[PDB]
Design an enzyme around this catalytic site. Structure first.
Site, PDB file in Angstrom:
ATOM      1  CD  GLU A 193      -2.899   1.151   2.063  1.00  0.00           C
ATOM      2  OE1 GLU A 193      -2.539   0.455   3.066  1.00  0.00           O
ATOM      3  OE2 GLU A 193      -4.158   1.731   2.436  1.00  0.00           O
TER       4      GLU A 193
HETATM    5  N1  LIG Z   1     -11.473  17.010   4.818  1.00  0.00           N
HETATM    6  C1  LIG Z   1     -11.179  16.132   5.790  1.00  0.00           C
HETATM    7  N2  LIG Z   1     -10.886  16.504   6.960  1.00  0.00           N
HETATM    8  C2  LIG Z   1     -10.572  15.422   8.273  1.00  0.00           C
HETATM    9  N3  LIG Z   1     -11.184  13.966   7.693  1.00  0.00           N
HETATM   10  C3  LIG Z   1     -11.478  13.643   6.549  1.00  0.00           C
HETATM   11  C4  LIG Z   1     -11.700  14.631   5.405  1.00  0.00           C
HETATM   12  N4  LIG Z   1     -11.454  14.012   4.283  1.00  0.00           N
HETATM   13  C5  LIG Z   1     -11.399  12.485   4.753  1.00  0.00           C
HETATM   14  N5  LIG Z   1     -11.245  12.637   6.060  1.00  0.00           N
HETATM   15  C6  LIG Z   1     -11.712  11.219   7.246  1.00  0.00           C
HETATM   16  O1  LIG Z   1     -10.397  10.119   6.633  1.00  0.00           O
HETATM   17  C7  LIG Z   1     -10.789   9.126   5.827  1.00  0.00           C
HETATM   18  C8  LIG Z   1     -10.326   8.965   4.182  1.00  0.00           C
HETATM   19  O2  LIG Z   1      -9.319   8.036   3.912  1.00  0.00           O
HETATM   20  P1  LIG Z   1      -9.783   6.745   3.265  1.00  0.00           P
HETATM   21  O3  LIG Z   1      -8.084   7.343   2.177  1.00  0.00           O
HETATM   22  O4  LIG Z   1     -10.741   7.654   2.109  1.00  0.00           O
HETATM   23  O5  LIG Z   1     -10.134   5.975   4.485  1.00  0.00           O
HETATM   24  P2  LIG Z   1      -9.859   4.108   3.118  1.00  0.00           P
HETATM   25  O6  LIG Z   1      -8.905   4.059   2.263  1.00  0.00           O
HETATM   26  O7  LIG Z   1     -11.560   3.672   3.306  1.00  0.00           O
HETATM   27  N6  LIG Z   1      -8.265   3.439   4.696  1.00  0.00           N
HETATM   28  P3  LIG Z   1      -7.394   2.621   4.069  1.00  0.00           P
HETATM   29  O8  LIG Z   1      -7.572   1.008   5.029  1.00  0.00           O
HETATM   30  O9  LIG Z   1      -6.387   3.323   5.345  1.00  0.00           O
HETATM   31  O10 LIG Z   1      -7.381   2.898   2.978  1.00  0.00           O
HETATM   32  C9  LIG Z   1     -11.530   9.049   6.489  1.00  0.00           C
HETATM   33  O11 LIG Z   1     -11.979   8.131   7.370  1.00  0.00           O
HETATM   34  C10 LIG Z   1     -12.588  10.439   6.891  1.00  0.00           C
HETATM   35  O12 LIG Z   1     -13.434  10.341   7.920  1.00  0.00           O
HETATM   36 MG   LIG Z   2      -6.603   3.570   1.752  1.00  0.00          MG
END
Ligand SMILES: Nc1ncnc2c1ncn2[C@@H]1O[C@H](COP(=O)(O)OP(=O)(O)NP(=O)(O)O)[C@@H](O)[C@H]1O
Ligand SMILES: [Mg+2]
EC number: 3.6.1.15
Lengths: 585, 102
Positions: A193
């Site tokens: 990743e």
């Molecule tokens: N502008 C923002 N301000 C604060 N928090 C945010 C913002 N944008 C996204 N987030 C948070 O950050 C995360 C977004 O990361 P994301 O890459 O979408 O997660 P993911 O890829 O599903 N998890 P992973 O398995 O670690 O890749 C979410 O859990 C949101 O709640």
């Molecule tokens: Mg991710």
């Protein structure tokens, strides 16, 4: 006219032909499962087969955010292992008789994903483009990350078998010929990743390539990159990755296990090489860290006093119910906390820390890691996630305390944060150690919505320079002033009001704890600055401007995983075109 | 008594409080202590069997077995310097045949 007519036709049969192909990467991240639809230019040449122009890879649609794979699996377990399997011994061999039903549940999710992909394809592609795309087949790479990396027993890998079979039986009605195989569709490790994200960054910023524009073969026959490859930091929902190439010939401790891009088959031999440190930390993502921080802060006496937990990372005037449940900031300025276990931000960690998960049951060191973060594996789930002796959380808006709490809780913990055997095996227990052990002059790019919002917010209020270069003490200042803000309820809802008559902005569900992330950033930059080598510079970015001007795609690991496969031209040609979708017959 | 020819030399040397592997990694310190190596003590002490003058043989196989069992084969914490084994999913010999078998 005739003499041309012939050479026209002769050129045709002697040269290469370009054709458009669709590539789908489905991100099975912690927070959700979503498609990313890419287009790419393929070239077929007489006696040479077919390959992709890597610089032509471009995103054309990011899909809707459907249920993460954890949901699917835990929803499966609820029904077939019985409610509250998180708190009881569950005999795993029994759940083999419910494979078909796992399939069924997975089918529901995949139908949405397929339909969504198709919607994006239909809307973005003209009729001529459609013909080429439907003809060549559409490779699908579905990769699960931190959201399910920690999942126990054999369930996750069984699920992937079923997912692949589902991807490989697409609806014939739309005519797009999706397919996959066990190399493209699979769980990806934390380090992968990281590495893919690293690859994405340097590809899009045109730092990494094979041609004379981006490479020099040196006097001694080794291909070098012309510009320095840049490291990346990505903070997702559940995990964060730190990746950087080592300045060449860095002597590492024997325990620190760096990855060589050629040696480890990440990039083909014709690309420049590098040894790169790539480590991913469970619990360091936005949601994960959020739940863990609360549990740890609010079971420490310095902060919990007779039912009230004083949180240095929340604004003065803000207060909320005392749990790790999802916080909705309501229009009336109250903070509503969802008690639904599934939407509770400790659910992943609490689930992993079951005494009935063999990972704890047989491994005392994992038990110890749970307990050190105030999860008691022997208690039932509800209890495990409960913050004991705590009614409300009140914000005290003290940035420096917030920083030092993030420091000891998240960045430099006594024991490694749970479910991080991977990181540890690389030679890294904590974020702290990464920069103590290896360090590099490689410039660093910081990515992730959270991280970006942190810097943007301080920028928007003119607390940081527009041209902020990564100076830690400058950031600590801006954050200190900002996090001092008082929360004021007005007719127009809850408002974050800055000190010294400095302006304001609405408080909402996304920014209410953003100061934590500012502390995380500050901590991380401090460790960086303390390293033997320090990154030549640091920047924050969401996407990279393409040659055109507009970005071709998003930062992340998506482009990287495509590049990791398509760059090995002979292997790819074999899998994508020779075997292709026709394999599914 | 020559330290070099002492069969605890390797393990005692790894378990130095001044080896970053222990110094920064408490889990490794715990592993050392659980096997009666104290990282904070100097080497001689570390390898010294405290309060013991002679070792007499009692020739009891079954006790020998159950001592090998809890010390070597199925220890509470993983025997030190085994991050590799552990990352494969195996802390102790015990677990190998519990988890996979053929
Ligand atoms: N502008 C923002 N301000 C604060 N928090 C945010 C913002 N944008 C996204 N987030 C948070 O950050 C995360 C977004 O990361 P994301 O890459 O979408 O997660 P993911 O890829 O599903 N998890 P992973 O398995 O670690 O890749 C979410 O859990 C949101 O709640
Ligand atoms: Mg991710």
């Amino acid at each position: 006219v005739g003499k041309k007519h012939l050479q026209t036709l002769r050129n045709l049969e002697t040269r290469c032909h370009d054709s458009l192909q669709a590539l789908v990467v489905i991100d099975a991240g912690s927070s959700s499962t979503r498609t990313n639809v890419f287009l790419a230019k393929t070239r077929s040449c007489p006696n040479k087969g077919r390959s992709i122009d890597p610089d032509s890879i471009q995103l054309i649609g990011a899909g809707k955010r459907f249920a993460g794979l954890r949901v699917v699996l835990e929803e499966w377990l609820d029904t077939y292992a019985g409610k509250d399997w998180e708190s009881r011994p569950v005999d795993a061999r029994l759940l083999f008789q419910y494979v078909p039903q796992m399939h069924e549940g997975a089918k529901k999710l995949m139908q949405l994903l397929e339909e969504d992909t198709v919607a994006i394809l239909d809307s973005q592609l003209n009729e001529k483009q459609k013909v080429q795309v439907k003809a060549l087949g559409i490779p699908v790479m579905l990769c699960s990350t931190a959201g399910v990396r920690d999942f126990h027993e054999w369930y996750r890998d069984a699920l992937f078998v079923l997912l692949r079979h589902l991807i490989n039986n697409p609806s014939p009605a739309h005519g797009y010929k999706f397919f996959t195989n066990p190399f493209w569709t699979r769980p990806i490790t934390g380090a992968e990743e990281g590495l893919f994200a690293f690859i994405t960054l340097n590809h899009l910023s045109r730092r990494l390539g094979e041609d004379p524009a981006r490479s020099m073969i040196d006097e001694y026959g080794v291909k070098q990159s012309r510009n320095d490859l840049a490291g990346v930091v990505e903070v997702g929902g559940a995990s964060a990755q730190i990746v950087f190439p080592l300045q060449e010939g860095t002597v590492l401790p024997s325990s620190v296990r760096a990855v060589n891009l050629q040696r480890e088959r990440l990039l083909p031999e014709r690309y420049p090489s590098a040894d790169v440190v790539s480590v991913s930390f469970m619990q360091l993502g936005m949601a994960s860290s959020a739940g863990l921080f609360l549990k740890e802060l609010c079971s420490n006496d310095e902060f919990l006093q007779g039912g009230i937990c004083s949180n240095p990372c929340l604004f003065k005037g803000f207060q909320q119910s005392c749990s790790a449940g999802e916080v909705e900031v309501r229009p009336d300025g109250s903070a509503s906390v969802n008690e639904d276990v599934r939407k509770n931000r400790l659910k992943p960690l609490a689930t992993y820390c079951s005494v009935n998960n063999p990972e704890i049951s047989f491994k005392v060191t994992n038990e110890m890691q749970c307990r050190e973060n105030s999860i008691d594996p022997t208690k039932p789930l509800a209890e495990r996630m409960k913050i004991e002796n705590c009614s409300i959380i009140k914000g005290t808006g003290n940035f420096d305390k917030c920083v030092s709490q993030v420091e000891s809780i998240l960045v430099a913990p006594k024991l490694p944060l749970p479910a991080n055997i991977e990181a540890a095996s690389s030679g890294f227990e904590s974020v702290d150690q990464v920069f103590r052990f290896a360090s590099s002059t490689a410039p660093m790019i910081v990515t992730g919505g959270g991280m970006l919002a942190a810097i943007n917010t301080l920028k928007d209020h003119r607390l940081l320079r527009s041209d902020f270069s990564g100076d830690v003490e400058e950031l600590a200042e801006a954050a200190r002033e900002f996090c001092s803000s008082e929360v004021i309820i007005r007719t127009d809802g809850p408002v974050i009001q800055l000190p010294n008559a400095r302006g304001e902005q609405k408080l909402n569900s996304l920014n209410f704890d953003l100061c934590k992330t500012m502390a995380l950033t500050v901590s991380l930059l401090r460790h960086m600055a303390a390293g033997e080598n320090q990154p030549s510079f640091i920047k924050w970015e969401k996407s990279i401007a393409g040659p055109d001007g507009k970005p071709l795609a998003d930062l992340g690991w998506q482009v990287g995983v495509i590049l990791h496969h398509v760059l090995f031209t002979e292997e790819w040609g074999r899998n994508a075109y020779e075997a292709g979708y026709s394999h599914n017959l």
